[PDB]
Amino acid sequence: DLASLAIYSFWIFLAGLIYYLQTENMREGYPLENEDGTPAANQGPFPLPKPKTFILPHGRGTLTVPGPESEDRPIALARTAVSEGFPHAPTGDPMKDGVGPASWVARRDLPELDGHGHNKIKPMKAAAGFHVSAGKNPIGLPVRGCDLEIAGKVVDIWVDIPEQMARFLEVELKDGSTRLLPMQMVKVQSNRVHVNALSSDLFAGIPTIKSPTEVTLLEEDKICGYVAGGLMYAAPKRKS
Amino acid sequence: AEYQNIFSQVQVRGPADLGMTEDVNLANRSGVGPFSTLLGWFGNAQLGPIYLGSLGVLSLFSGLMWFFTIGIWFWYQAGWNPAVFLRDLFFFSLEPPAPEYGLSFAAPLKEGGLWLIASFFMFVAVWSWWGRTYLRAQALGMGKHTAWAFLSAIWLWMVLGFIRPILMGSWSEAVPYGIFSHLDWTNNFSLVHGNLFYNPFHGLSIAFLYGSALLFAMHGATILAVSRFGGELELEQIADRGTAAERAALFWRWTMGFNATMEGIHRWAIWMAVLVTLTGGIGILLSGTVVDNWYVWGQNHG
Amino acid sequence: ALLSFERKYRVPGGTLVGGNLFDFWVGPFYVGFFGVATFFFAALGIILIAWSAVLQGTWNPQLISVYPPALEYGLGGAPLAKGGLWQIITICATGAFVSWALREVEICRKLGIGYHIPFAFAFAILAYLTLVLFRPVMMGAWGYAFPYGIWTHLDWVSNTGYTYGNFHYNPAHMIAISFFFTNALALALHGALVLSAANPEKGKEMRTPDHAATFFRDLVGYSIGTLGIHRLGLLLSLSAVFFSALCMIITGTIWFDQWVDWWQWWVKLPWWANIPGGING
Numbered sequence: 001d002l003a004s005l006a007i008y009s010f011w012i013f014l015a016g017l018i019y020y021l022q023t024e025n026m027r028e029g030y031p032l033e034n035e036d037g038t039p040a041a042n043q044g045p046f047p048l049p050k051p052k053t054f055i056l057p058h059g060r061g062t063l064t065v066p067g068p069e070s071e072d073r074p075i076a077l078a079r080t081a082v083s084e085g086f087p088h089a090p091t092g093d094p095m096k097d098g099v100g101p102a103s104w105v106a107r108r109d110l111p112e113l114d115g116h117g118h119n120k121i122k123p124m125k126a127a128a129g130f131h132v133s134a135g136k137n138p139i140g141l142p143v144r145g146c147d148l149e150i151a152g153k154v155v156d157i158w159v160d161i162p163e164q165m166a167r168f169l170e171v172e173l174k175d176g177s178t179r180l181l182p183m184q185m186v187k188v189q190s191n192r193v194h195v196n197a198l199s200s201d202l203f204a205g206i207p208t209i210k211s212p213t214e215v216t217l218l219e220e221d222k223i224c225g226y227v228a229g230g231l232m233y234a235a236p237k238r239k240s
Numbered sequence: 241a242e243y244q245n246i247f248s249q250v251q252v253r254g255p256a257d258l259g260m261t262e263d264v265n266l267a268n269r270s271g272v273g274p275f276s277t278l279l280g281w282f283g284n285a286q287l288g289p290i291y292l293g294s295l296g297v298l299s300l301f302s303g304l305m306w307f308f309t310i311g312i313w314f315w316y317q318a319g320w321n322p323a324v325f326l327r328d329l330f331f332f333s334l335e336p337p338a339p340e341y342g343l344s345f346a347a348p349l350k351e352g353g354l355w356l357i358a359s360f361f362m363f364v365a366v367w368s369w370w371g372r373t374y375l376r377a378q379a380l381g382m383g384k385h386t387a388w389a390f391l392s393a394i395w396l397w398m399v400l401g402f403i404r405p406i407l408m409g410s411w412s413e414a415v416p417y418g419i420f421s422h423l424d425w426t427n428n429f430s431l432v433h434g435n436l437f438y439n440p441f442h443g444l445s446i447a448f449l450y451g452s453a454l455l456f457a458m459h460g461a462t463i464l465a466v467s468r469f470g471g472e473l474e475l476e477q478i479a480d481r482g483t484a485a486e487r488a489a490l491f492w493r494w495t496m497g498f499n500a501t502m503e504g505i506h507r508w509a510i511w512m513a514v515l516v517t518l519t520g521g522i523g524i525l526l527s528g529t530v531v532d533n534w535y536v537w538g539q540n541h542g
Numbered sequence: 543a544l545l546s547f548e549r550k551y552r553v554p555g556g557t558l559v560g561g562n563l564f565d566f567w568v569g570p571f572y573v574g575f576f577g578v579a580t581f582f583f584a585a586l587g588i589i590l591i592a593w594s595a596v597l598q599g600t601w602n603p604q605l606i607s608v609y610p611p612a613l614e615y616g617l618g619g620a621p622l623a624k625g626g627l628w629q630i631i632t633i634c635a636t637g638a639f640v641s642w643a644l645r646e647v648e649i650c651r652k653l654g655i656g657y658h659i660p661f662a663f664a665f666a667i668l669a670y671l672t673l674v675l676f677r678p679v680m681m682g683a684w685g686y687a688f689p690y691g692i693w694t695h696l697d698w699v700s701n702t703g704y705t706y707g708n709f710h711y712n713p714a715h716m717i718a719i720s721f722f723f724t725n726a727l728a729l730a731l732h733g734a735l736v737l738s739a740a741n742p743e744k745g746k747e748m749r750t751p752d753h754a755a756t757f758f759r760d761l762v763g764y765s766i767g768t769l770g771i772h773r774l775g776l777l778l779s780l781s782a783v784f785f786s787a788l789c790m791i792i793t794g795t796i797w798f799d800q801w802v803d804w805w806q807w808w809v810k811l812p813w814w815a816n817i818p819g820g821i822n823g
């Protein structure tokens with residue numbers, strides 16, 4: 001009967017679907033590798049999917065995945081045990097060498113453009129018409145570290161024009177240079193901005209940008225990455 | 241404590257975004273609506289503009305005559321007494337024609353005709369809007385995913401009041417128009433066919449219903465956790481994998497053995513939810529037409 | 543073993559308890575103290591089920607079922623074969639869930655990501671605990687809980703529901719359902735939006751989230767945005783499970799009659815409770 005047939009068919013269908021769905025989630029990260037970077041033996045039941053090419057906007061080229069993968073940067077780590085499956089210890093200063101929760105990716109060193117060709121993220125002083133419609137205005141306030149000692153003061157709000165949303169907060173240190181702190185990493189308060197992630201003496205450590213009016217994809221990652229890894233590495237300089 | 245990014249803490253406003261053009265007839269897009277500071281904490285605060293156009297207004301109208309037609313019948317039952325209307329608002333109901341009339345349209349307005357009217361006006365309103373979702377994507381040069389997925393939701397709805405009542409032989413097997421009333425139909429329907437619980441599809445259907453709450457709570461929470469790296473900027477992470485995309489995958493790889501890609505997860509997402517109405521549609525179609533009782537079917541499988 | 547880009551991420555640290563004792567991986571699985579507490583509660587718990595299987599006389603999953611102690615036992619203990627096993631199993635179970643949540647916390651920490659996933663999960667766990675714990679305790683016996691059987695747990699939903707008539711009329715259960723519906727709709731739309739923008743028509747170049755935000759404005763006259771649609775998912779999902787526990791915690795405790803007769807508070811309001819005509823008039 002039909003019913004029994006409809007249901008036997010579905011499960012055969014659902015199996016191809018799961019087959020279909022999993023190979024698709026293998027376009028990035030695969031093939032797998034041994035801790036030393038060489039092709040692993042057991043690669044799993046599912047095979048790599050036939051390559052697909054994307055056509056990046058604003059004529060920035062193409063993207064084929066699956067494709068030859070590479071970190072395109074040096075990793076400062078070392079084995080801690082002679083058997084596969086243990087943690088790898090940072091040979092230098094994790095925050096600076098870019099590892100652990102402070103690691104970044106070698107994205108494109110080009111800024112993001114909106115649908116119309118313009119840079120997607122601009123400072124607010126360069127963003128005509130934009131202003132703080134609601135909530136406390138951060139600009140003008142001192143930025144405090146996870147050690148309760150001040151590190152600087154907010155000078156501007158880098159916003160996402162297409163989604164009209166603040167992504168970063170420009171900050172001025174003692175030497176008078178600025179830095180980008182991701183919005184999703186600070187608690188704006190009635191009289192100050194708090195950054196539990198970093199400690200006073202770590203803002204200078206933050207990666208700086210090349211152009212004072214643009215952040216590239218590569219630089220976004222180094223910034224966000226650096227700021228995040230201090231939840232672990234800046235821990236010995238914090239109090240609750 | 242730690243920032244959770246649930247609600248924005250600083251709002252920012254700029255020149256109303258009139259949006260991309262492409263092959264769209266900018267002559268139809270209305271003007272920009274106001275800005276909602278309220279809605280501005282969860283997400284964007286810009287209301288409007290909305291693309292009207294021919295087929296679009298058709299839907300808007302057909303969709304209002306549906307509501308208004310059910311409304312006047314609700315009022316006939318209320319005896320045009322304002323007080324009764326708000327009281328028995330959930331009790332009223334525009335039931336389908338008696339099983340005697342079958343699949344005909346020669347039924348009286350006080351015994352089923354007014355239902356048929358309402359259903360025709362809604363048959364128009366939904367399909368024309370479906371087309372709207374397809375055309376509105378053609379104009380921007382995008383994929384028709386939203387179109388096909390909306391089709392599955394229709395598949396269930398169609399089976400419920402069109403395809404099934406016709407395969408059975410009368411408009412009486414259709415769903416009525418009312419709050420409480422369509423709540424009894426649902427219960428009755430199971431009872432008449434031997435407790436839907438024994439239905440393989442209805443049960444496969446709940447698998448995805450729950451599955452959607454699991455996938456979306458999972459996806460959303462994962463994306464919020466990595467937004468500190470620009471996670472919510474997915475399309476972006478798709479053309480250029482950032483630390484937000486790798487850490488997001490690694491969390492799930494170390495938790496349950498396997499992970500997904502920034503795009504792949506949206507293929508799980510889309511299919512996980514669509515498979516809800518797709519299965520519950522085959523389940524309700526085969527119920528009462530090929531299978532009379534699911535407990536019985538359950539003992540055999542034949 | 544590793545994803546091409548995984549090594550820079552596997553560093554020591556993040557452990558809530560233990561230090562570096564269980565700070566390593568088994569294949570692609572991260573272990574950890576809670577990684578070991580989990581395998582324990584699970585193994586032991588799977589054993590108590592194969593044992594409650596010999597005491598029933600069946601090894602068929604579709605038959606196998608672990609029932610709770612009869613109402614006569616109350617909140618007291620019970621013999622293994624008669625309510626005993628279920629009780630240790632609820633402990634092993636509750637122990638497996640909380641321990642899996644805390645294992646994700648340690649993972650969260652390593653990677654430096656947010657604690658939103660384990661938090662969310664915790665809502666699921668709370669629903670389970672509402673059924674096997676919070677409700678029973680409040681009523682007076684472990685017999686008001688559900689059993690562990692593929693088809694016997696559904697018999698419970700069925701019988702449990704009708705025990706109050708058409709469960710459809712539970713106001714909380716009513717609300718909880720809309721969130722479940724909405725979530726699906728949102729999950730469909732979202733995964734359907736992103737996929738369309740990154741997979742346009744042939745020969746055309748990858749669309750931008752600007753095309754995306756437009757598409758919806760042209761459709762519904764509004765675009766919640768990227769960060770918003772995700773805050774929306776998470777919210778509808780959790781809100782959906784919150785109203786599911788709330789609808790059950792009040793069922794049998796503050797309200798134990800027919801749910802349909804509850805809506806009589808609205809209809810019998812002095813203002814219009816006696817105006818003739820309508821459905822009740």
Ligand code: BCL
Nearest residue numbers: 397400415419422426710715716717719720721723724727
């Ligand atoms: C699936 C099996 C049954 C069924 C079983 C149930 C059960 C069980 C429940 C509902 C619930 C609801 N169902 Mg029903 N429902 C069915 C088919 C439908 C159809 C349909 C066209 O096929 C519609 C329009 C509805 C409509 C509704 C809403 C009244 C309510 C919340 C739904 C929701 O969250 O959507 C989410 C989607 C949206 C984002 C948009 C829609 C917004 C809502 C508010 C719809 C408004 C339009 C209008 C029809 C409502 C009139 C109320 C006032 C007079 C204005 N059902 C089939 C027949 N449905 C719940 C309810 O509370 O019932 C009282 C409930 O507990």
Ligand code: BCL
Nearest residue numbers: 442443444446447448450451454670688692693695696699
């Ligand atoms: C919460 C609402 C009600 C209830 C009402 C229903 C209804 C109604 C139905 C189900 C259905 C199912 N229920 Mg139930 N169910 C409840 C509580 C539970 C519990 C629990 C510990 O609390 C669990 C584990 C399950 C598990 C299950 C599955 C057997 C099945 C598919 C669910 C699914 O797709 O979810 C989505 C989750 C995923 C896709 C993730 C993967 C889930 C896999 C499938 C888990 C399987 C576990 C199972 C085989 C037991 C393993 C335990 C031991 C380790 C061996 N239910 C409570 C009492 N359940 C449907 C069914 O068809 O089964 C008869 C069905 O019709």
Ligand code: BCL
Nearest residue numbers: 393397426427429430436437442445446449520521523524
């Ligand atoms: C006593 C009740 C019976 C029962 C009888 C039924 C019946 C009858 C049906 C379901 C259906 C469903 N049941 Mg059941 N079910 C029971 C117990 C359960 C339990 C449980 C006990 O825990 C659960 C979790 C479910 C869960 C579910 C869903 C998985 C499924 C519907 C999915 C859906 O999202 O449709 C919601 C989506 C839609 C209806 C699509 C409609 C889309 C249209 C196009 C919307 C148009 C809007 C309109 C024009 C108005 C515009 C809006 C305004 C502008 C606001 N059932 C018991 C056994 N169940 C359906 C099913 O598929 O079964 C196999 C169904 O028909």
Ligand SMILES: CC[C@H]1c2cc3[nH]c4c(c3C)C(=O)[C@H](C(=O)OC)c4c3nc(cc4[nH]c(cc(n2)[C@@H]1C)c(C(C)=O)c4C)[C@@H](C)[C@@H]3CCC(=O)OC/C=C(\C)CCC[C@@H](C)CCC[C@H](C)CCCC(C)C
Nearest residue numbers: 299300303307365366369389390393514723726727730731
């Ligand atoms: C795949 C399964 C899920 C799904 C998917 C889905 N639904 C969809 C789509 C998709 C992918 C669309 O693209 C399409 C859409 O455009 O959404 C934005 C749609 C949609 N699903 C909708 C509803 C809906 N979907 C549902 C279910 C589901 N949809 C599934 C769970 C349900 C239920 C019952 O669970 C409902 C109620 C619509 C929002 C939209 C289709 C709109 C449509 O067809 O309109 C036709 C007619 C009109 C224009 C009528 C308007 C008449 C109203 C003015 C009357 C009411 C007035 C009222 C008092 C107003 C106040 C409301 C207050 C809250 C402020």
Ligand SMILES: CC[C@H]1c2cc3[nH]c4c(c3C)C(=O)[C@H](C(=O)OC)c4c3nc(cc4[nH]c(cc(n2)[C@@H]1C)c(C(C)=O)c4C)[C@@H](C)[C@@H]3CCC(=O)OC/C=C(\C)CCC[C@H](C)CCC[C@H](C)CCCC(C)C
Nearest residue numbers: 450453454584587634635638642662663665666690691692
């Ligand atoms: C809160 C919103 C929804 C949600 C969210 C959610 N679920 C989650 C998460 C989140 C955010 C996770 O991070 C976590 C996960 O890792 O997903 C991949 C999880 C998860 N949700 C799961 C299942 C699940 N979630 C469900 C529901 C939901 N999850 C909600 C609807 C459901 C149902 C029935 O709707 C199920 C079946 C797991 C896949 C996974 C958690 C895995 C886990 O806890 O592993 C530890 C435990 C074991 C390895 C097994 C223990 C064995 C026991 C000791 C004995 C068996 C006893 C059991 C009670 C028998 C029941 C028999 C049934 C037939 C009744």
Ligand SMILES: COC(C)(C)C(=O)C/C=C(\C)CC/C=C(\C)CC/C=C(\C)CCCC/C(C)=C/CC[C@H](C)CC/C=C(\C)CCC=C(C)C
Nearest residue numbers: 307308310311312359360363398400401402415418419422
């Ligand atoms: C304030 O008062 C006024 C009068 C101003 C109002 O406007 C108030 C109005 C309200 C009181 C309206 C209330 C409306 C509701 C309570 C509506 C509830 C609707 C549901 C619960 C619907 C549930 C399910 C519906 C289903 C499954 C419908 C399916 C329809 C179809 C598939 C259409 C099938 C087509 C038919 C039979 C005709 C086809 C004919 C052809 C020629 C093709």
Ligand SMILES: CCCCCCCCCCCC[N+](C)(C)[O-]
Nearest residue numbers: 042044496497498543568569570
């Ligand atoms: C190093 C290879 C590791 C492969 C292990 C993959 C784990 C598969 C995920 C669990 C399978 C789930 N299930 C039973 C719910 O379908």
Ligand SMILES: CCCCCCCCCCCC[N+](C)(C)[O-]
Nearest residue numbers: 018022043044045497498499570
């Ligand atoms: C119901 C959800 C079940 C999920 C399907 C299981 C897919 C397992 C994929 C394992 C992939 C193995 N690999 C390559 C990562 O080692």
Ligand SMILES: [Fe+3]
Nearest residue numbers: 459463474736
């Ligand atoms: Fe997403």
